[PDB]
Swiss-Prot record, chain A:
Coiled-coil positions: none
Family named by the database record: Belongs to the cullin family.
PTM annotation, UniProt: Neddylated. Attachment of NEDD8 is required for the E3 ubiquitin-protein ligase activity of the BCR complex. Deneddylated via its interaction with the COP9 signalosome (CSN) complex.
Annotated tissue distribution: Brain, spermatozoa, and testis (at protein level). Widely expressed.
Subunit architecture: Forms neddylation-dependent homodimers. Component of multiple BCR (BTB-CUL3-RBX1) E3 ubiquitin-protein ligase complexes formed of CUL3, RBX1 and a variable BTB domain-containing protein acting as both, adapter to cullin and substrate recognition subunit. The BCR complex may be active as a heterodimeric complex, in which NEDD8, covalently attached to one CUL3 molecule, binds to the C-terminus of a second CUL3 molecule. Interacts with RBX1, RNF7, CYCE and TIP120A/CAND1. Part of the BCR(SPOP) containing SPOP, and of BCR containing homodimeric SPOPL or the heterodimer formed by SPOP and SPOPL.
Associated pathology: Pseudohypoaldosteronism 2E: An autosomal dominant disorder characterized by severe hypertension, hyperkalemia, hyperchloremia, hyperchloremic metabolic acidosis, and correction of physiologic abnormalities by thiazide diuretics.
Additional remarks: High-glucose conditions in renal tubular epithelial cells lead to up-regulation of CUL3 expression, significant increase in CUL3-mediated ubiquitination of MRPL12 and dysregulation of mitochondrial biosynthesis.
Gene: CUL3
Domain of life: Eukaryota
Protein name: Cullin-3
Function: Core component of multiple cullin-RING-based BCR (BTB-CUL3-RBX1) E3 ubiquitin-protein ligase complexes which mediate the ubiquitination and subsequent proteasomal degradation of target proteins. BCR complexes and ARIH1 collaborate in tandem to mediate ubiquitination of target proteins. As a scaffold protein may contribute to catalysis through positioning of the substrate and the ubiquitin-conjugating enzyme.
Annotated localization: Nucleus; Golgi apparatus; Cell projection, Cilium, Flagellum; Cytoplasm, Cytoskeleton, Spindle
Swiss-Prot record, chains B, C, D, E, F:
Name assigned to this protein: BTB/POZ domain-containing protein KCTD5
All residue ranges annotated as the BTB domain in the record: 5-107
Induction conditions: Up-regulated in peripheral blood lymphocytes stimulated through the T-cell receptor.
Part of the full-length chain shown: 40 to 153 of 234
Subcellular location field: Cytoplasm, Cytosol; Cytoplasm; Nucleus
Coiled coil, from the record: none
Domain notes: The BTB (POZ) domain is atypical and mediates the formation of a homopentamer instead of a homotetramer. Homopentamerization is due to the presence of 4 residues in the BTB (POZ) domain: Leu-17, Gly-61, Val-73 and Ala-79.
Superkingdom to which the source organism belongs: Eukaryota
Oligomer and partners: Homopentamer. Interacts (via C-terminus) with GRASP55/GORASP2. Interacts with CUL3 and with ubiquitinated proteins. Interacts with CRY1.
Record function comment: Its interaction with CUL3 suggests that it may act as a substrate adapter in some E3 ligase complex. Does not affect the function of Kv channel Kv2.1/KCNB1, Kv1.2/KCNA2, Kv4.2/KCND2 and Kv3.4/KCNC4.
Amino acid sequence: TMDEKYVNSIWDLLKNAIQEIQRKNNSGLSFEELYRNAYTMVLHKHGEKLYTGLREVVTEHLINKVREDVLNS
Amino acid sequence: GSVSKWVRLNVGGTYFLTTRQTLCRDPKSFLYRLCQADPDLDSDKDETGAYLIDRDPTYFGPVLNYLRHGKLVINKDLAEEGVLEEAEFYNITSLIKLVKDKIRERDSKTSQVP
Amino acid sequence: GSVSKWVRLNVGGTYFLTTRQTLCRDPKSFLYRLCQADPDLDSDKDETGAYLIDRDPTYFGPVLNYLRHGKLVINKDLAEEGVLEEAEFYNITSLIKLVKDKIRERDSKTSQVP
Amino acid sequence: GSVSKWVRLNVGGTYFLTTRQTLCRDPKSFLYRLCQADPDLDSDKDETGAYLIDRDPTYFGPVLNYLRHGKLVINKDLAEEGVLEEAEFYNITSLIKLVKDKIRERDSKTSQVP
Amino acid sequence: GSVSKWVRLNVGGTYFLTTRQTLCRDPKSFLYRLCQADPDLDSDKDETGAYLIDRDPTYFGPVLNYLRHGKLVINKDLAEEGVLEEAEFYNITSLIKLVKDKIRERDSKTSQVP
Amino acid sequence: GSVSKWVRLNVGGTYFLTTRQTLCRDPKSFLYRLCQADPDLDSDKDETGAYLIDRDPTYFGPVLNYLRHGKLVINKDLAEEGVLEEAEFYNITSLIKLVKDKIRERDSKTSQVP
């Protein structure tokens, strides 16, 4: 079966990046890497989770950080 | 200096040299993204100055061929799906479109009956 | 630096370059164990830094590319068994599975009766 | 030296060294235009002084061979269509005049029912 | 002795290394003239000392190896019709002969009537 | 340095670094004689000490690979006979048998038509 934890493994790497991109210190990332991981996940059709995972990660940042500062301003 | 007109690819270990415009037929494509001089993603530069793309070094021929002359150039022994699985990656749909027809065209004879 | 995200191969004298994670589509595989940086079983290296892999590089196309994009990458005149035999060495269980279907699938026509 | 009869072509990644006379076989050829010492052209690698031509090095062999010994030599792997379009770029009206016939000859022979 | 027995043929930009007596199988050969220290060779030399020759670097393989072990080595992909016109230039008369038969030999199976 | 277990051959220009034990696999091979530190040797490229061996590098692959793992590994583009001649020069008897079987298998299959 295609089931495996590696799906989570790429999740993180894609996730730690996205968080970093939102954290505005992009210098530590690589486009070639990132595109491939995102690519492989959807290739064996787990995108509907990755899209969902995408929805959460950005949602996390705005509400938890962006919303706070605008309140503080 | 800070910019140049030639981009050097290290696809799969083999090296390619091509022009920026060569990487701009489809500006949604992976190749286009590297072609940009944005500092937002450092990319995977190599000491040779090449951009380390880590997919098949060989099936990249037909992909870059279309990115210079807009037609399906396949070495006879190369595998049609080979470029397709390569074309999907770089995100140039037009080649991906015509590739599928070439496969379907292939089977009109290879799937025929007497 | 302390580590590079990609490790070069030198299978049978020919060269293949890819990122560390490409060698990990089936951790229970020959390439995976060496892909790790564990010194306790660390193999030897070519002075280019690539890993020596003493085996047929001709049929490595189908194998390494399936590790990248998980499909059967065939070349026009590469033998059906060779991919089976090669894949068996690398121990990426799914690949060895799908080939067996391909050969049987092939014999569906190659062993077909009018 | 002020001039050198040897021109150094960097044709898309694979170097080609050839004589000025060989490129100048018919001046209409885009290759001929490169050879001239006029001030229009300035694209070359600074260290080595090789013209940067961004096209498929593989298919350039048949193009240059015709410009060296006046015949169409194509390795079995190189696609005839690939040299054809490759030839079209350099504007060697004779070569393209030839390739289509071999192309047609290739196809006519294949699809020919007895 | 202010002279060497090994020469560096810079054919087609490629560096081929070979020893004087290797090239003298046919003294009427182009190379045999290159092999000497005549008063009409000094101009054709590189900064390294390699002789600058301006023909195909890849079809040269069968020619040079024939001058080594008197047998044709045609890498399977290469075209028999292509070395012939590289043979003609070098003036290996005997080698010109056997390739021509090989060309004729190929048609025995390819120009056959089932 | 007392001695270098690594030795740097030159085989038709291409440097092939290797170790003595690789070269000492066959008591009667040409390469074995090179390993001897006796005074009968004068082809050292003294700029580095690389011994010069004027023959085709391309077919030196299978010779050196077999000289490390005792199986005839091939890059398909290389000629079947060329490796026969190439090893024949180096005097690796066991190998030249294997290739003579390889050719026998190649042609024998090629020599049959149902």
